[PDB]
Every structure is written in C-alpha cells, then in structure tokens.
Amino acid sequence: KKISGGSVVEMQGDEMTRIIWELIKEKLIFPYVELDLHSYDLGIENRDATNDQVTKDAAEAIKKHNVGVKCATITPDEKRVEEFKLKQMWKSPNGTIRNILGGTVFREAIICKNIPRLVSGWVKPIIIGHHAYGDQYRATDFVVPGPGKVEITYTPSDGTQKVTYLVHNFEEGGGVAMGMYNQDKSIEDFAHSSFQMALSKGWPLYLSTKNTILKKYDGRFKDIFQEIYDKQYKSQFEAQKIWYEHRLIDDMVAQAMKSEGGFIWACKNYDGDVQSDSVAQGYGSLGMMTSVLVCPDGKTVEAEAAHGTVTRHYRMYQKGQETSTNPIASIFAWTRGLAHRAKLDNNKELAFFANALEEVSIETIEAGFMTKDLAACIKGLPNVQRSDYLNTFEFMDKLGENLKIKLAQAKLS
Amino acid sequence: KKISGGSVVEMQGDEMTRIIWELIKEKLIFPYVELDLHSYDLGIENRDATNDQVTKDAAEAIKKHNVGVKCATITPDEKRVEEFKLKQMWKSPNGTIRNILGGTVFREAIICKNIPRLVSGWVKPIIIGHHAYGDQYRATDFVVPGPGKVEITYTPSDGTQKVTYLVHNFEEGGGVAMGMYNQDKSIEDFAHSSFQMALSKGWPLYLSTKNTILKKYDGRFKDIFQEIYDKQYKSQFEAQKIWYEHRLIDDMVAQAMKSEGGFIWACKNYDGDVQSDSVAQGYGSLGMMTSVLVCPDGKTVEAEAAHGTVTRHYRMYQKGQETSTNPIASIFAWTRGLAHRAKLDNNKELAFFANALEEVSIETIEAGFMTKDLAACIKGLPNVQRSDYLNTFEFMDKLGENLKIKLAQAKLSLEHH
Numbered sequence A: 001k002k003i004s005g006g007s008v009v010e011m012q013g014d015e016m017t018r019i020i021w022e023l024i025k026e027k028l029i030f031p032y033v034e035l036d037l038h039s040y041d042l043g044i045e046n047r048d049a050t051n052d053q054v055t056k057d058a059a060e061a062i063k064k065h066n067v068g069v070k071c072a073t074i075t076p077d078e079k080r081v082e083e084f085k086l087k088q089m090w091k092s093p094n095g096t097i098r099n100i101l102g103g104t105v106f107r108e109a110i111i112c113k114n115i116p117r118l119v120s121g122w123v124k125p126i127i128i129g130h131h132a133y134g135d136q137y138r139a140t141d142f143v144v145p146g147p148g149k150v151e152i153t154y155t156p157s158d159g160t161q162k163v164t165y166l167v168h169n170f171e172e173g174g175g176v177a178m179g180m181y182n183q184d185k186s187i188e189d190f191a192h193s194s195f196q197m198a199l200s201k202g203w204p205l206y207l208s209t210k211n212t213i214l215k216k217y218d219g220r221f222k223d224i225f226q227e228i229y230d231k232q233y234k235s236q237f238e239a240q241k242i243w244y245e246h247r248l249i250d251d252m253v254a255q256a257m258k259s260e261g262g263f264i265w266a267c268k269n270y271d272g273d274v275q276s277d278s279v280a281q282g283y284g285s286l287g288m289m290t291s292v293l294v295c296p297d298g299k300t301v302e303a304e305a306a307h308g309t310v311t312r313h314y315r316m317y318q319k320g321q322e323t324s325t326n327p328i329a330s331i332f333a334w335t336r337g338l339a340h341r342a343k344l345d346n347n348k349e350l351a352f353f354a355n356a357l358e359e360v361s362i363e364t365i366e367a368g369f370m371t372k373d374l375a376a377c378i379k380g381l382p383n384v385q386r387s388d389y390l391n392t393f394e395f396m397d398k399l400g401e402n403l404k405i406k407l408a409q410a411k412l413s
Numbered sequence B: 001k002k003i004s005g006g007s008v009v010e011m012q013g014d015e016m017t018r019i020i021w022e023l024i025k026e027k028l029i030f031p032y033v034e035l036d037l038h039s040y041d042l043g044i045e046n047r048d049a050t051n052d053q054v055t056k057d058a059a060e061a062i063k064k065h066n067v068g069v070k071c072a073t074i075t076p077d078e079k080r081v082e083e084f085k086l087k088q089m090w091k092s093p094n095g096t097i098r099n100i101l102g103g104t105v106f107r108e109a110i111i112c113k114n115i116p117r118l119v120s121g122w123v124k125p126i127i128i129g130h131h132a133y134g135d136q137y138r139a140t141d142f143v144v145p146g147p148g149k150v151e152i153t154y155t156p157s158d159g160t161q162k163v164t165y166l167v168h169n170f171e172e173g174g175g176v177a178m179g180m181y182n183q184d185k186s187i188e189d190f191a192h193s194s195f196q197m198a199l200s201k202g203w204p205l206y207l208s209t210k211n212t213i214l215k216k217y218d219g220r221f222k223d224i225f226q227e228i229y230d231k232q233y234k235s236q237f238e239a240q241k242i243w244y245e246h247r248l249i250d251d252m253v254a255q256a257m258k259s260e261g262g263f264i265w266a267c268k269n270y271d272g273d274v275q276s277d278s279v280a281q282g283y284g285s286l287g288m289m290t291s292v293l294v295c296p297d298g299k300t301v302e303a304e305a306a307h308g309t310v311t312r313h314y315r316m317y318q319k320g321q322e323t324s325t326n327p328i329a330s331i332f333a334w335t336r337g338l339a340h341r342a343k344l345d346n347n348k349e350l351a352f353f354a355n356a357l358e359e360v361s362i363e364t365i366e367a368g369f370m371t372k373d374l375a376a377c378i379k380g381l382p383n384v385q386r387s388d389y390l391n392t393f394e395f396m397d398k399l400g401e402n403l404k405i406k407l408a409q410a411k412l413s414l415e416h417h
C-alpha cells in the first residue's frame, strides 16, 4: 500500500510553522508514506518542560538515524520569557542541534519560473554554505577608553615560549579593539561538508575569503580547503566535470550577481550570515528558502525551512484573520530529508515520491496558484487582490489534490 | 601648447591594469597635459626590490603634493610569493597608503544610458562611503599552532592596572586568532565626510554595522555617528528633506537590493570593500566604477580604480590572446585625480580637460563602441559575438580619436577664447 519510508527523526515546532507542519504530514506525507518516525516536540513549551533536554535528545537521535526533518522553532528572548513564563532563557535549538551534529547549513532558494528575481540573470539557485562557528560571533570586543597599548598574546599549553603581538598603541585618544578566533577542526569539518554538498548536487564549489589581507587567519581557510580538496575530493569533482576554486570575497559576490546560478558557495560566518535575507528577497520570498545541515560524513543531514515561525501571520490566525503563509520551504524540508533517506537506503519508491512532491509544488505555483507573498513578487504588494492568492489552508488543499492526481497517474505507468 | 597640469603623484601597478595604465598615459594624457610628474613604481617587483619602501614613499608624496593617481596592484599571498620569488608576503599597498593618509573612500558607478543593469530597480546611483582606516586592513593575525590560551590585553597610559580579556583557550588543537582596532577620531572624521557627502548630493545617508554581535566595537560606530548627526547635521538634513539612519548590515544589504538607489551608504572597511564590487556589478561592470579617497582635510585625494589587476584577463594576454578589459575605471582615476588638481590650483583648462575625457568616455560607449563586459550586459554573455565589442586596444584607439576631436574643438571654442 504505502511506501516504506524508513527511520526519520521529526522535530515539531512553533506558531504558524507548527500548523503547516501538521498539514504537510496529514495531507502530503502520511497518506502515501509509512515511516519509522522518531518524533520530538521542540515546541517552546515542551522545551521548557524538559529544560531543553528534548532538543539535545533530538540531535542525538539524528546522529543515530542520520535523517532529521525539523519545523521552525521560537528562539527565546526576554519577551518570550514573559509570554510563556519560561524557567530559563533557553538557547536557539538550531544552534544546539548544529553544535551537536557538527555540520554546516546550506540554504537554497526554490525557483519557480514565474516568480521574478531581483537579479536578472539568475536561472539556477546559489547554495550558500554557512560556517556557523567562531569569527565575529564568538569574539571579545571592548571600548578602549583612552591612550594605552592593546596587545594579543598566545600562551602555549606545553609551557614553551609565550608570544606577544602589538595590536595598536593608542597615542591620542581612545577607540575600540577586539579579538576573534577560529579552530582547525571546525574549518576542516566546514570543508568536508562543502565538498560533500557540491558532489551530491553535481555543482562546482567556491570558497570566499580575504586571504590577501588576513594572510594568516583567512589563509588557513584557503589552505585547509585546498589540501582536503587535493587529497580527498579532486578526482570526484573532475569525474563529475565540476571543480573547486578559492576567490576573494569582493570578487565572489560580484561573480554571484553576474552568474546564472548553479554553484555551491562556502561562506565564512560573517559573509554567509549578513546576506541570507538578501538572497531570500533576491529569489522571491523567505517562504521559498529551504536549508539542510550537512555533516562532514556526508551521511547525516537535518533539513528545515530557512525562515522562522512567521509570528506575525500566527497572530492573525489567533485573531481569526485570514493568513497566506508559504509552505514550500517547509515542504522541501520533508522532500530533501526523504530524498536523502532514500539515497541511504537505495529506496527507489521513496526517491520517486520525494521528487514528485517537489514537482507538484513547483507546477502548482507555476500554474498560478500561490500564496500572497509570491503574488506580491509578481505584482507588487499594493496591487495584490484577494483573487490573486490562496490562503494558508486553501493552498495546502490545492497541493494535496495535485499530489493525489500526480501519484494516481504515476501508478498507471 | 599642452595644458599645464601641475604636480601629480603617479603609482604604476601590475598585470592587466599596468598595460592599460601606459596606454592611458601615452594616448589620453601625455599628448594634451604637461605634468610635474612624481612617479612611483608600485609594481610587485619594485616593491620587492625596495622592501616595500616605495609604497611608503608614494604615500608621503601624496601627502606633500595632495593629488595621487594609483594603478591597481598585486597584494601577495603564498601563491604570489612563489610566482615572483618574493622576499615576503608584502602587505597591501592600498592598506598602507590608506592608513597613512586616512579618510573615506567614495566609490560610485559610471553610468551609460545603453547599459542594462543587473538590478532593474537601481534607477538612481548609489555612493559607497568606505572608511579607509583600521579594522581588517590594520589587523594582527596569526596561526595558533596547538593547544594554548589566546588573550587580548589593554595597558592604559594612565599607569593603572592592565585589563586582560580571554579570546579563546584552544584545548585539543590549533587554529587562528587575530586582533584588530579602530580609533575614535578616525570614526568621527568618517562620520563628518559621510554627512557632508549626503548633504552635497541631497541624498539620505545610511550607516551599516553588526552592532547586534559586536556591541562594543560596532556600537562605537553607531554611537559616534548618531552623536555627530544630532548635534551638527540633523537640522540641515531635514532642511533638504533627507535623513540619516543606522542599519544592521543584514537589513541594509536587503534594503539596498530592493531600493531605487539614490543614497549614500557609509560602510566600515570590510563592508565597503565587498559593496564596492557588488554595487559596481549591479550597475553593469567592475570596470565602470570610480573610487576617490578623500583625506579628512579635504585637500588631499588619491584616485584609483575600485577593481584589481584583472589577473584572469592578464593570463589570456600572456598566452597571446586578444583581451577586452574595460579601461574606464582606470581612466576615471586620472580624470578624478586631475579634476582635484585643477580645483586646488584653480586651473580652468585642466578642469575642462578632466571633464571632457569623462564625457568622451561616456559618449563613446553610448555610441555603441565598448569592451566585452559592457556588450555582455546588453546582449547577455552567451550571445555576445566578436562583432559586438572592441578589444582593449581598439577601444583605447576609439577613445583617443574622439578625445583628440573633442579637445581640438575646445581650443577653437569661445570659452577657451
């Protein structure tokens, strides 16, 4: 009857994405696929009840079963503490999971040909791999109050000679200073994840640094990537007629705007983070941005939407006002997780299903059925009328009918 | 009968831009302008021979004569050391010059009517206000060879106790660490140049930081800009119905991509570096962008192309293949440098020459004669044929033809009379 899906780790989420997540399971997944589902409720309340232990348990389950699909979750702040009366201000579950798995998140826009892009020549997506460790995000910065000397020092653990460098001698007034770092193993894992992602997609890979300026700091990224490429991955790239190349960051961003798309882009922490919103708006909507965490083994993945829980739409839903929330990124978390599960298990039936759900979602939007965010990209939000879009539940119903028709004609060979 | 040009500091560069540089001088400058030329060879080989002292010499010359025009230069890494057998990995000459001169680098695309953009919304220009001092260009980075503790310390001049901050304790391996800084006074001058540029153009101004992560480092930039705005510029902005607003760099990049253009973008050193190439490409080509470093005094300027030596095109040139590198940005380094020289000396003839060469450049491209990069914006790179563009030297020939006619008509005109 149903396709045997295998073991999948499922992580339930919050707010509007929580509603869509159950609609996806009930209307798109469960009628056709039978899964060994290991479910973890990462809803903000269950996280509070378990003192965030449910988040660590889910990450360990992903490590054992190799495939996880996650719904967007609330990252607590001070207002969230008051809203839910949380015991503590729990940290981001995405950060906790990524730190336990040790992978790199790759974000990819889902492209439908009728949705215009802000950059004219983009025909294929640009997949950015984000090294989410170190650099500015673990740095120590401080105000320099007046004249004085700032130095950075290194004291070896083996008791050998301590090294000291002059950062700056403030002579006239004050200013600011900061120290930051990165780690060899994290960079090596970042490289492995990047090479594995490029090989799975069959696309070339680019790493961006500023090693001409940061000769030691950024040069280490360039050296680690090149040595791992030359020793472990180059023949696989050549056999697929792809390649790896290092580029300076300023040249790289311009090359990305000029390109047609269709490459993997390994980004340092800052470079990947600061442009994520622009890539989403550049291709259309945040609702079309999916993501996958790829571990250096190439075997363990965790897929999820690259956007949040869409709190503003959830507030409208709570007051009975019509919402039109895009489910594509959430749906593609399931198809990408299920497609990886099928690749691990040599499951042709599941691989066919995952691709069929992708085609169904793209064909539906390209046929003119879309949510308000996509209609606004075509027409401009001030010009969007009610007849231009389907609400959140109508669009899920339309996807469910098209998927049923697609699989029914696929069963007729 | 040549135009008396005055004192100009010239800095020769590397690879493809070095070849274009000589063509500009022999075809567009030397036949029409007689200069008191102070030339410094910043080619990678002469920098290696002088142990990079020629770079410091050029910066001091710019300080003395107040006008510098620089060709793009190689900043070496390990690959360049082996290529040229260098004595060491010399620091970027631009970082050295900018950190001696200080100030703000203003960068803006060169717009021709027949060149489609990559960002269709950018109907107005975007001017990048790039802080030229500190941050990554004056950073101290090193390899961490193994387990150990990295700390950053502050020892105040007032004799009180040293302050020690833990950066990271490497426990099981090695990695990298670095320290960087900036100075209150240079941030203040950066703010003043940004506000004054916005008021001169009549456009709003935005400053982008990452103060959500670097609350102290980037918070200082945000605080200094807001302090100077509220106390010295806010009323003037409101008189022109413009404004200044701080933006998170994440929001600013997305906001700029959705925008109509027509604003000044004050950027920190690293961000202004990336945005220079990105904004140039969005309007058409890296070869169509000016860049002028303006020192806090306003008297000294260093003009340059925003792009690099175009190594990839030079590699084709070395193979004996025809290349179509865009020389406009390098030409506008000369015209912008000479225009400031004319302003300092109140040299009407030289001021006319600089503007005339810029007009000839625009007019030549808008007439259909352009390099391959601009033909690709019109036709799309998969569709461009050899018949659609000129190589670098044919294009320089066409410019020289039109400039000779333009300057000949100027000397017969009434304004010269």
Ligand SMILES: NC(=O)C1=CN([C@@H]2O[C@H](COP(=O)(O)OP(=O)(O)OC[C@H]3O[C@@H](n4cnc5c(N)ncnc54)[C@H](OP(=O)(O)O)[C@@H]3O)[C@@H](O)[C@H]2O)C=CC1
Binding pocket: A071, A072, A073, A074, A075, A076, A094, A285, A286, A287, A304, A305, A306, A307, A308, A309, A310, A311, A312, A313, A324, A325, A326, A327, A329, A373
């Ligand atoms: N993956 C994760 O677990 C992440 C979770 N979050 C959490 O999500 C919550 C909300 O964060 P927020 O800043 O609002 O960011 P969101 O991504 O949730 O939403 C921001 C805006 O983007 C638009 N948007 C995003 N996703 C969709 C979609 N699927 N369909 C239609 N429009 C969409 C909406 O615009 P408009 O209002 O104009 O219609 C929305 O208001 C926070 O608690 C945050 O911590 C945040 C980031 C990642």
Ligand SMILES: NC(=O)C1=CN([C@@H]2O[C@H](COP(=O)(O)OP(=O)(O)OC[C@H]3O[C@@H](n4cnc5c(N)ncnc54)[C@H](OP(=O)(O)O)[C@@H]3O)[C@@H](O)[C@H]2O)C=CC1
Binding pocket: A212, A248, A251, B071, B072, B073, B074, B075, B076, B094, B285, B286, B287, B304, B305, B306, B307, B308, B309, B310, B311, B312, B313, B324, B325, B326, B327, B329, B373
């Ligand atoms: N101000 C300076 O002195 C600078 C010096 N450099 C140095 O230059 C060298 C090369 O740097 P790189 O990263 O390649 O950056 P470049 O700016 O030199 O070139 C990158 C790419 O941009 C395009 N491009 C740039 N300028 C032009 C132009 N005038 N006409 C047409 N296309 C152009 C070309 O793209 P395509 O290949 O698609 O045709 C080129 O391959 C390095 O040694 C670097 O240190 C770099 C930046 C600034």
Ligand SMILES: OCCOCCOCCOCCOCCOCCOCCOCCOCCOCCOCCOCCOCCO
Binding pocket: A018, A019, A020, A022, A023, A026, A043, A045, A318, A319
């Ligand atoms: O057939 C499936 C299709 O279903 C469509 C969507 O289904 C949604 C189901 O989501 C998953 C839930 O299923 C698992 C069971 O979960 C148990 C409860 O899960 C918690 C989800 O939150 C539900 C809302 O309750 C939150 C409790 O309130 C806390 C704060 O309360 C504030 C006061 O309430 C405000 C109500 O609105 C006010 C409007 O003015």
Ligand SMILES: C[C@@H](Nc1nc(N[C@H](C)C(F)(F)F)nc(-c2cccc(Cl)n2)n1)C(F)(F)F
Binding pocket: A119, A249, A253, A254, A256, A257, A270, A271, A272, A274, A275, A278, A279, A282, B249, B252, B253, B254, B256, B257, B270, B271, B274, B275, B278, B279, B282
């Ligand atoms: C989606 C765009 N990515 C991107 N765009 C810009 N600039 C835009 C062109 C604009 F000027 F409009 F803001 N900058 C960056 C960047 C990256 C790393 C560090 C920094 Cl500081 N910036 N990334 C892409 F790919 F289309 F170029």
